[PDB]
Structure formats: structure tokens, C-alpha cells
Write a protein that binds this ligand. Structure first.
Ligand SMILES: Nc1ncnc2c1ncn2[C@@H]1O[C@H](COP(=O)(O)OP(=O)(O)O)[C@@H](O)[C@H]1O
Lengths: 574, 619
């Protein structure tokens, strides 16, 4: 209700001087439209009943000039209003994207990309449409009404009180209807969204919907949603149906009273006939503008909920922040230290990770393995600071990770997440993200290390073979290998592998790892794994279960001392 | 684009028809209200006639004849004036006769009240009818969706049926409700105003009707000019959406590696381009209304001047011209909306034809209420040769036998046909040649509600609706008790991670902040399958995203410990399958070999080969 205006009065500020010109152009166009009946009154007054056809044609030329001015001013108003609305949309999109860019992974997951995209483009377009409509169409009715009152005062104000009382009652009736209708419209929009959600959920898993033979429950849920939406829409239709007839009746009754009082004034000889025609045309214009403006009032609740959804994003401050007093070492080696670190979402009953105390030497391959959901997926994000430590501390080369400059840390971190993704263009373009200036020889070396050259070389385009927008056109193993190679051409101090090796063939994993230790043994490698065969070769192995460390050491010591890792190994062995 | 206009409109009108007399009454009330709303201004013009007659007759000397007054005016000149005096009912020296004006205005006011009441009642009835027919359409679409065979959802595109079933009915609502009211009232209004105008004068009527060709031509020309800019804006917004998808979906990768600023610059360039395109498109789109209003205003100039000069000749009275001007305005008012609502009308008609084509799709064969029951789980297959389409034999000469205590496993490379195997076992598709029997009962003569409610089946992917995790697990059996849900949940080890969420068992799994990755998604689905208490469990590679330890624990606890029920296991990891009762090796749509782990180890073949892929990966 109020969020939309709190957004408009902020993000239309650069276009105040342009809204001023569109307002004055609309005022002039509307004033000419209402001036046409004025000169019509003049021609019927002193042209008719006097027999002067020269005055008839002269005032006809005057009216042609007036309508030409009206069209030029209306065209200019539409042009400038379109520019203002489009610029507002551009500014809002830029601001929303910039604010989203500063988000961490936590808030990005909280909103979700599939909804963030629409919230940054289509839910900006929905407000842009309302801004343009209210600039070019909606404000016509108030402008029409004020101009009508002014022209009534100009044209024998002795009866202008009729318009001065008629317009306020029409405004009060329409405002009452709008006030009683708008919450119903908002509820109807929310219920439409809900029924669309129900239908989408039913369509997505129709196979599993029929698998459990739960058709009656789905039918009942859909019937309930449809019925409540129907009730809300029926109330909205009632209010909207008691809307046009009220305005039409008000205008017609005011016109009848106008005829009566105009006849009374003509009897006294202080009125002329043409003014009645002018007043009737004023009323017709007011009715036309009111109908054409308040017809579009369905747009406002949709834009209101839309602006609320956008303000959800715009009002969320990022948790991650640079310390503003960052430590700036010349370089950071591959020494990773975790000391009693814990991580938990707010309000969670138990932490997702707790009491981790493992450390790695200057250059070492360390693999962390654990069961699904046992906090292993968050340790990688904690090292590179996607999230932040709630209790405990994590330090890089002896200095706390929360105090280190985050951009330098990311420049020194070569990470491939479990959320495997690629960008559009060629393989060379995606691979360029590693260094942005490497020669093709370095890229080929990267594919050789990542065991991706064996298949990419067969393509005639070579490094320039096109890829899908989301990487769908490649297989999961190929996507993981490409991400691996993108990591390889960075020469980072620490390698951060987020179960990328899980989707690869075991021989391919072994060759990738041995090539990696052939080229970058000095660089520290941290691996979170779901499969033992990628963990046996690691120098140090740490196992976490239920969000807590349950073992640490070398592989054979893990068999000898850790029952949980023994179970893992006996379940993985063929 | 649309392919059928007349038929789609006819069947939509038929869908609104079945109330018969109610629709007839709606049309009648609309016609009435329009007719009285048109007649009203004529009565106002008659009142203005009386006023004008009185005011111009008070000037002439009293007691003279009207013809004598005209002659006296003409004798001094003023030929146009005398021709005017000749053009109304007047007697010199007479007053304005306020009684006649009062009764005329009372009649006009009563008619206006009646017209307003009729229009309000018509709008109310039409709204009720539209909502009723829309509830009927939604119920019909739901019944259709629950009656379609799975072949449609398989053959249809991913993003097509959702917009066909969800957005199309919304377009149906925003089409029928808007047009059948506004278009009908506007057409009736323009026709009634036209016939009234012709009753008043045809020479002015021509000047008021020349607008329609001009206005329609202007609208069509502006649409033709706008089409290139519209497609440019569409393409630019598509590029912007693609770039935003790239940035948001791969947010981690762009955030890392320091490519934030490059993405920001690319977004800035795309935003400037779409700003330019949208500016042009919206300007040319909104240009239409000023142009048609200009054409109508020019018509207003024409009618005003011609009526004035013709009244100066005395061919008609002043009140007729006042009414005529009001009719000209009431004639132009609906034209602008009618010109622009054609796109909405045709969009609604196309959506209606699409929805009715969906509703005309053939349904799967009716159920046979045999009410089958399971007692031993002896699932047997014989000579099954099912294929999705006439062509490649996706399944060929397939045959197998199960055991009551068997957790038999089907293993093979991706694309072999295990998913279609379990789908056929679900009767999702018909089987050509061969027969499927369980416990000696042919499932072809068994109702699907009796069959699928007892098997229990999980896909590789996970379907989770917009409910809490608790409802998601309880969907397997809503009649289950509150703590039975928790027991089935802790049997599937979802409780191992659910308590780490912000709201345990109450998290909106649709709204979740990404804390539920694929493995725990599969854990939740496995818990839901457990809660249903099935006796013929099958696992279509819901085995994928979970760790092997949790894998083996769950598989043991709810397939091998539960010896009373047989099970089907599908997994790409041979470890998770080892030591199971009977193993089926299948490739190229047929079973290569079958036996136990020791047996396929002893005889070297395909199974020995994939065992030589992971551990002994001799490549
Ligand atoms: N629309 C479709 N969806 C799925 N499979 C299809 C489709 N059309 C044809 N097929 C064929 O049906 C077969 C089904 O294989 P599938 O059961 O998915 O194997 P797996 O269970 O190993 O994934 C595929 O080999 C595929 O070629």
C-alpha cells in the first residue's frame, strides 16, 4: 500500500523536472480539449441566433487551431512521459541489480535465483507500466475535473457552483469505491498467485501425484483454492460493477440540474444558451476522462504487491562486509587454519557445523569426507567466506579470514562449487574467467590437467566451441572437468574443490589428481568428497558426522581408529 | 499465433450459453440501459429547445404571428435570422413555460435513474455469470489434468503445458469478463447513437462516421510502425533476462574470480540498450490514443461548424444540435477502447482455442475396478517389448521373475531404460506385446488406484510442492499420525539434517534458502515413500545424490530388514547394490544377464566389466 510510493518518491527523483513538463503538457492538452466546448458556446451564442456565418467559419478555424495545439501537446506529453517512465525503469533495474550484486550466498539462496531474476526485470517492468499509465492516462481525470471547474468559472461563473458541487460528489463516490475495492483486488491477486502455484506444483510432479494415488487430495485442494479465488473475484466484480453506473448517474443527474438552473438563469436574462452546450460538453468530457482513467485501476494493486516484493530485496542489508581496515599481505600461502569454528542458521535448533579444529600445512592435499547433510557442504563456503563464522574463528596464514581483504582472498582462491555452472559463449570464454589474459597454450595445458582436452580437441572449433547459456549442452562430467580447468588456469595458493570429483569417472579423477599434484603440488588442495576413492591419496583426511569432527589423520589410521570411516570404506569397496 | 477465430469464439459463447435465459436477460438489460442512455440526451435537447424557443420568442413583439414575425424580420434584412426563426415552434411574446421544461427534465431524470439501475444490474449479473463459468472451466481443467495419460506430459514441451493451463485461463478471464461487457456495451452504444444521429440528421452523420475509417487506418498504421520497435524491445529484454540468469544462477562463480565488475558493465550496456528500445516501443505504443482523439476532435470541429451554419439556415433546431454534439462525444468515447481491445479479444480467443484443444485430448482408458491385492510380491515379466513410439525398441524381449524377499537390483548405463521399466510397472504407459503380472494377477485388468496405491515408487528427481517439510513427508499417507511421520522420517535419516534448518519440519521447502541440497531432497522423498507403508517398493535412482553410508543404512533398514516386502533397486553405484538378492544386468533395452553378485563375478561379462570401472578401473 505504502511501499510503492516509498519507492516511487525515491527512484523518480532524477525525473522531477521531466514529470513537470509532462504535467504541464497534459494540462495544456486537457485545457484545449475543454476549450473546444467554450468556443462552441461562443459560436452557438453570437454566431447562431444572430445569423453571422462569417463568425461560424472564423470560430471553426479557431477550433481547428485549438485541436491542432491539443494534439501536439498530447503527443509531446506522451513522448516525455514515456521517456520518464522508461528512465525510471532503467534506474530501478540498475539499482536493484547493483544491490543484488553485493549479496552474499546466504541471502542469494534465501531469495533464489529463479525468483531474483523476475524480481529484477519483470517486477520492475510492472511498476514502469504503472508509472507510464498514471503519467499519460490516469492523471487525465483529476486534470480534466480541475480544468472543468476552471472553465466553468471562466464561462459565466454564476452557475459554475453546479459543477463545483457535482465534481466533489463524483470524486467522493469514486474514492469510496476505490477504497472498498483495492484490498479485495490485492487479495484476489494473491489468491491468483496461490492457485497458479497449486497448478504448477500439480503439473511438475503429475507422475508422482499419480504414484501415490492421491488424486482426491489434489482435487480438494484445487477446488478450495478455486472457490476462495472465485469469492474474492466476485466481491471485486461487485465493487467494480457498482462503479461505472454511479459515475454515469452522477454526471447525468448533474446535467439535468444544469439544464434546470440554466433555464432559470436564462429567464432572468443573465445567461445565454451556448453556455448550456459548453457545460454539457464539460460534463461529457469529465465523464469520459473519469471512465478512461478509473478503468485502469486494476493495475495499482498488482504494482503495489510488486513493489513490496522488490522492497524485500532492496531492504536486505548484506551480512558479509569488508572490515574497512583490511590486512593487506603481499601474498598468502596455502596455510588454512580452523579453530573451534561453528556455523548455524538463525533460529536453528542445532548447528550445521560445530567444533571443527582441523588445520593444513603450507602445501598439502587435504580431503574432508562426510555423510550427506552433515555440514561438509558448508565448510568450503566458510573457507572462502560465502557465509560467515557465527562462533569460533577461521584464519588464513595465521590472520583471521574475516579480517583479510575478501577480494584478495578470492583472487588467491581457486574454487569450483557443487553448484556447477557455466556462462554463454565459447569454451575459451568460460575458461577465460580463470585469468582473463592467459594464452591459448595455458588453456590447452589446463584442459590437459583437467582431462578435458581429450574431448574438446576433437571439436573442429577447438577452444572456440560454443557452450549453452547454462552449460546444459555438456554432460555433468564434462561440466565438472571444464570447471576444474577453469580452476587450473589460476595458479592459486589454495585449491577449493567442492565435490566436483564426485561426478567424474574414477580413472579420470585419478588422472586429474595426479596431474594436479604433478603441476601444483606446492599449492594447498582442499577437497570435500562423497566417495572414498578420491580421499585415499590425500595427505590428511578429516571426517565430520552430525556437524562435528569424528576423525582426523591419514587414511590407514582412519581405518584403524575411526569406525564411521570404516563403515564408509566398507560400503564404498566393491 | 491464432489458428481458429470463428470456431473458438463460437465455443466460448457456447460455454457461456448454458444459462440460456440468464444470458438473454443480461443482453436485454444491456440493450435497455444503452437505449435509455441514448434517448436521455435527446430529451435534454428537447428541454434546451423549449428554453431557446422561449428566450428568442420573448424578444419579438407580443401578439404577432410566427410567419408575421419572420416576415417582419426579413423586411429589415437579416435573411439568415428569419430563416432561423422559421425553424422552431415559437409564438412571439411567449414565456419559457417552466412547467413543460420541469416535466421534461423530470422524465429525463427518471429515465437516467432507470438506465443506471439497469446497467448496474446487468453488470452484476454478467460478473456472476463470468465467475460461475470460470469456476466451471477451472474444475474442467483440473479433471482433464487428472485424466490425461502421461504420454501428453512426456510429448509436450517443458514450458508449454504450464502456460497453457495456468496463464491461458487467466487470459480467458481477462478476455471474457472485459470484452463481453465493454465491447458489447460499446457496440450497442455506437449503433444506437448512429441510428439516433441519422434520425437527427444524415448530413452531419456522415461527418461523424468518416472518423471510423480514419481512426482504424491510423491505429493499423501505428501498429505497423510499432511492430519493429516492439520486436526490438522484446529481443533486448530477452538478452537482459539471459544475462541476469547468467549472473544470478552462477552467482558463486561470478562473485569469485573477480568478474563482478565485468558483469556489472555488461549489465549496464544491456540496460542502456533495453532503455532505448523500451523508450521507442512505449512511445509508439502510447501514440495511438492521442491520434484517434485528434481524429474525433476534428470530427467535432466539422460537426459543430456544419450544425451551426445549417441552423443558421433553419433546417433544424438548436436542441437537436446540442443532443447531436453529445452523441458525437458519446460516439467517439468507445471507439478508442474498441480499437485497442481487439488485441485482448484475439489473445483471449487464442487462449480459449488452446485450452479447448487441451480439453479435447484423448483420455487414458477407463479403470477396471478389480481391486487387486498383494500377498507375496511375485512380480513377473514375459516378452515385454514396449517402446515410446513406433520405431526403436526401447524395451525388447524383457522378462524377469521376482521373489517375496528379494531386493532385486536393475543396473546399467544411463539411457538403458530402467526409468521406462518402472514407468511401465506403474502403468504410466501401455505395453505392446507381452504381459505383466504380480502375485499371479495381470495388472492390465487392474484399476490403477488399487495398484499404484500399494507399490510405492520414487523417481531420480524430486518433486516437492509449496508446503512445509512436514506436509511433504505426510503426503505419502495423510491419515498417518503425527508421531508416525516423525518415525518414518527418522527411518530415512532426514532428521539428521532437518534440525539444522531455521524451522525444523516447518521450513517452507519452496521458500527455503538453499539449505536443502539434492541429497537431502532425495532423503525427504525417501521419507515420504516410507511413510506410505508400501509393500512393493521400487527405487528409480533416488540413490543418486546421497552418500553411500546413508545409502546403505537406509537400503538395509527399509528393504532388507523389512523382509515381508520385495523391492526393486536402481543405482549407478555397484557398491550400493552389492550383496543384494538377485542382480539384473540390462543394456540396449534388454537384460544382458541376471544372478547374484558372486555369480556375475564368477562368469566374466558386462557386470564384471563395470565392476572393473570404479575400483579396478583398468582404462
Ligand atoms: N520423452 C522421453 N523421455 C524419456 N525417454 C525417452 C523419451 N523419448 C524417447 N525416450 C527413450 O526412452 C528411453 C528411456 O530410458 P531411461 O528409462 O531414461 O533410462 P535410465 O532409466 O537408464 O535413465 C531412453 O533411451 C530414450 O531414448
Amino acid at each position: 500500500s505504502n511501499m510503492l510510493w516509498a519507492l516511487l518518491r525515491q527512484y523518480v527523483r532524477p525525473y522531477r523536472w521531466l514529470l513537470a513538463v509532462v504535467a504541464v503538457l497534459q494540462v495544456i492538452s486537457n485545457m484545449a480539449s475543454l476549450y473546444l466546448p467554450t468556443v462552441n458556446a461562443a459560436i452557438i451564442d453570437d454566431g447562431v441566433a444572430k445569423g453571422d456565418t462569417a463568425r461560424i467559419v472564423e470560430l471553426g478555424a479557431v477550433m481547428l487551431g485549438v485541436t491542432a495545439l491539443q494534439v501536439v501537446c498530447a503527443v509531446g506529453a506522451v513522448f516525455f512521459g514515456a521517456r520518464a517512465a522508461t528512465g525510471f525503469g532503467h534506474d530501478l533495474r540498475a539499482a536493484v541489480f547493483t544491490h543484488v550484486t553485493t549479496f552474499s550466498a546466504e541471502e542469494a539462496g534465501r531469495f533464489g535465483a529463479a525468483s531474483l531474476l523476475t524480481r529484477t526485470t519483470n517486477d520492475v517492468g510492472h511498476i514502469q507500466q504503472l508509472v507510464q499509465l498514471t503519467v499519460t492516462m490516469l492523471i487525465t481525470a483529476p486534470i480534466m475535473s480541475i480544468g472543468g471547474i476552471f472553465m466553468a468559472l471562466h464561462q459565466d461563473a454564476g452557475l459554475s457552483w453546479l459543477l463545483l458541487v457535482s465534481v466533489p460528489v463524483l470524486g467522493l463516490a469514486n474514492y469510496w469505491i476505490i477504497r472498498h475495492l483495492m484490498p479485495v483486488f490485492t487479495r484476489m491477486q494473491s489468491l491468483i498467485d496461490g492457485i497458479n502455484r497449486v497448478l504448477r506444483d500439480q503439473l511438475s510432479g503429475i507422475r508422482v501425484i499419480r504414484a501415490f494415488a492421491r488424486e482426491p487430495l489434489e482435487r480438494v485442494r484445487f477446488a478450495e483454492a478455486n472457490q476462495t479465488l472465485s469469492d474474492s473475484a466476485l466481491e471485486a466484480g461487485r465493487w467494480q460493477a457498482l462503479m461505472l453506473p454511479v459515475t454515469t448517474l452522477v454526471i447525468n443527474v448533474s446535467s439535468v440540474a444544469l439544464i434546470w438552473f440554466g433555464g432559470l438563469r436564462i429567464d432572468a436574462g443573465q445567461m445565454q444558451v451556448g453556455s448550456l452546450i459548453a457545460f454539457l460538453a464539460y460534463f461529457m468530457q469529465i465523464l469520459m476522462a473519469v471512465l478512461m482513467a478509473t478503468f485502469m485501476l486494476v493495475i495499482f494493486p498488482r504494482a503495489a504487491v510488486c513493489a513490496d516484493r522488490i522492497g524485500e530485496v532492496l531492504s536486505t542489508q548484506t551480512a558479509i562486509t569488508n572490515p574497512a581496515d583490511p590486512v593487506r599481505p603481499a601474498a598468502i600461502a596455502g596455510d588454512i587454519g580452523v579453530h573451534d569454528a561453528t556455523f548455524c542458521y538463525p533460529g536453528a535448533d542445532r548447528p550445521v557445523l560445530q567444533d571443527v579444529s582441523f588445520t593444513v600445512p603450507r602445501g598439502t592435499t587435504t580431503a574432508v569426507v562426510g555423510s550427506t547433510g552433515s555440514g561438509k557442504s558448508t565448510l568450503i563456503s566458510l573457507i572462502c567466506r560465502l557465509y560467515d563464522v557465527t562462533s569460533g574463528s577461521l584464519r588464513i596464514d595465521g590472520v583471521d579470514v574475516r579480517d583479510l581483504d575478501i577480494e584478495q582472498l578470492w583472487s588467491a582462491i581457486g574454487l569450483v562449487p557443487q553448484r556447477g555452472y557455466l556462462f554463454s559463449g565459447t569454451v575459451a570464454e568460460n575458461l577465460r574467467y580463470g585469468r582473463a589474459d592467459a594464452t591459448d597454450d595455458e588453456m590447452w595445458e589446463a584442459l590437459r590437467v583437467a582431462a578435458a582436452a581429450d574431448f574438446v580437441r576433437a571439436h573442429p572449433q577447438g577452444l572456440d566451441m560454443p557452450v549453452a547459456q547454462g552449460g546444459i549442452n555438456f554432460s555433468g562430467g564434462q561440466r565438472q572437468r571444464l570447471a576444474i580447468a577453469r580452476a587450473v588456469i589460476r595458479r592459486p595458493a589454495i585449491y577449493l574443490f567442492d565435490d566436483a570429483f564426485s561426478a567424474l569417472d574414477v580413472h579420470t579423477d585419478a588422472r586429474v589428481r595426479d596431474a594436479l599434484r604433478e603441476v601444483a603440488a606446492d599449492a594447498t588442495v582442499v577437497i570435500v568428497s562423497q566417495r572414498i576413492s578420491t580421499v585415499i591419496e590425500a595427505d590428511q583426511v578429516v571426517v565430520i558426522d552430525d556437524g562435528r569432527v569424528v576423525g582426523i589423520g591419514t587414511h590407514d589410521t582412519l581405518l584403524a581408529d575411526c569406525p564411521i570411516y570404516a563403515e564408509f570404506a566398507e560400503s564404498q569397496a566393491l | 499465433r491464432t489458428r481458429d477465430f470463428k470456431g473458438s469464439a463460437i465455443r466460448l459463447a457456447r460455454r457461456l450459453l448454458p444459462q440460456r435465459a440468464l444470458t438473454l436477460a443480461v443482453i436485454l438489460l444491456g440493450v435497455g440501459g444503452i437505449a435509455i442512455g441514448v434517448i436521455g440526451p435527446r430529451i435534454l435537447g428537447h428541454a434546451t429547445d423549449l428554453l431557446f424557443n422561449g428566450v428568442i420568442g420573448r424578444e419579438l413583439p407580443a401578439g404577432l404571428t410566427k410567419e408575421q414575425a419572420v416576415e417582419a424580420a426579413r423586411a429589415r434584412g437579416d435573411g439568415t435570422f428569419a430563416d432561423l426563426l422559421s425553424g422552431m415552434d415559437i409564438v412571439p411574446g411567449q414565456g419559457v413555460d417552466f412547467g413543460a421544461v420541469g416535466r421534461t427534465l423530470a422524465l429525463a431524470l427518471g429515465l437516467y435513474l432507470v438506465a443506471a439501475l439497469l446497467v448496474w444490474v446487468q453488470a452484476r449479473l454478467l460478473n456472476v455469470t463470468v465467475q460461475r463459468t470460470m469456476v466451471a472451466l477451472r474444475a474442467e481443467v483440473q479433471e482433464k489434468i487428472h485424466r490425461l495419460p502421461l504420454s501428453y506430459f512426456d510429448s509436450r514441451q517443458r514450458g508449454e503445458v504450464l502456460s497453457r493451463v495456468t496463464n491461458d485461463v487467466d487470459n480467458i478471464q481477462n478476455s471474457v469478463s472485459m470484452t463481453i461487457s465493454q465491447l458489447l456495451t460499446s457496440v450497442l452504444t455506437v449503433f444506437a447513437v448512429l441510428v439516433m444521429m441519422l434520425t437527427i440528421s444524415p448530413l452531419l452523420t456522415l461527418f461523424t462516421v468518416v472518423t471510423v475509417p480514419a481512426s482504424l487506418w491510423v491505429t493499423r498504421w501505428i501498429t505497423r510502425r510499432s511492430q519493429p520497435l516492439f520486436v526490438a524491445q522484446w529481443r533486448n529484454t530477452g538478452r537482459l533476462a539471459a544475462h541476469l540468469e547468467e549472473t544470478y544462477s552462477g552467482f558463486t562463480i561470478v562473485k569469485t574470480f573477480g568478474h563482478r565488475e565485468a558483469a556489472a558493465g555488461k549489465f549496464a550496456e544491456l540496460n542502456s540498450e533495453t532503455q532505448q528500445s523500451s523508450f521507442g516501443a512505449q512511445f509508439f505504443s502510447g501514440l495511438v490514443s492521442p491520434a484517434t482523439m485528434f481524429i474525433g476532435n476534428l470530427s467535432y470541429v466539422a460537426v459543430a461548424v456544419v450544425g451551426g451554419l445549417q441552423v443558421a439556415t433553419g433546417q433544424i433546431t438548436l436542441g437537436s444540435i446540442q443532443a447531436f454534439i453529445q452523441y458525437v462525444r458519446q460516439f467517439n468515447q468507445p471507439l478508442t477502447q474498441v480499437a485497442g481491445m481487439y488485441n485482448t479479444l484475439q489473445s483471449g480467443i487464442a487462449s480459449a482455442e488452446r485450452v479447448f484443444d487441451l480439453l479435447d485430448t484423448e483420455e487414458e482408458s477407463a479403470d477396471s475396478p478389480r481391486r487387486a491385492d498383494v500377498r507375496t510380491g511375485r512380480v513377473e515379466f514375459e516378452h515385454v517389448s514396449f517402446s515410446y513410439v513406433p520405431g526403436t525398441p526401447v524395451i525388447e524381449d524383457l522378462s524377469l521373475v521376482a521373489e517375496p524377499g528379494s531386493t532385486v537390483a536393475i543396473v546399467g548405463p544411463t539411457g538403458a531404460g530402467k526409468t521406462t521399466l518402472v514407468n511401465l510397472l506403474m502403468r504410466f504407459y501401455d505395453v505392446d506385446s507381452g504381459r505383466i503380472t504380480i502375485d499371479g494377477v495381470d495388472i492390465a485388468s487392474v484399476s490403477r488406484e488399487s495398484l499404484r496405491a500399494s507399490i510405492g515408487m520414487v523417481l531420480q528427481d524430486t518433486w516437492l510442492f509449496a508446503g512445509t517439510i512436514y506436509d511433504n513427508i505426510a503426503y505419502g499417507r495423510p491419515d498417518a499420525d503425527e508421531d508416525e511421520v516423525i518415525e518414518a522420517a527418522t527411518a530415512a535419516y532426514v532428521d539428521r539434517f532437518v534440525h539444522t534448518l531455521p524451522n525444523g519440519y516447518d521450513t517452507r521447502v519452496d521458500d527455503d534458502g538453499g539449505a536443502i541440497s539434492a541429497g537431502e531432497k532425495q532423503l525427504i522423498t525417501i521419507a515420504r515413500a516410507v511413510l506410505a507403508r508400501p509393500k512393493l517398493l521400487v527405487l528409480d535412482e533416488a540413490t543418486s545424490s546421497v552418500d553411500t553410508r546413508t545409502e546403505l543404512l537406509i537400503a538395509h533398514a527399509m528393504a532388507e530388514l523389512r523382509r515381508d516386502r520385495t523391492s526393486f533397486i536402481i543405482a549407478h553405484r555397484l557398491s550400493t547394490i552389492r550383496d543384494a538378492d538377485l542382480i539384473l544386468v540390462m543394456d540396449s533395452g534388454r537384460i544382458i544377464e541376471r544372478g547374484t553378485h558372486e555369480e556375475l563375478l564368477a562368469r566374466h561379462g558386462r557386470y564384471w566389466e563395470m565392476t572393473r570401472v570404479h575400483l579396478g578401473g583398468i582404462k
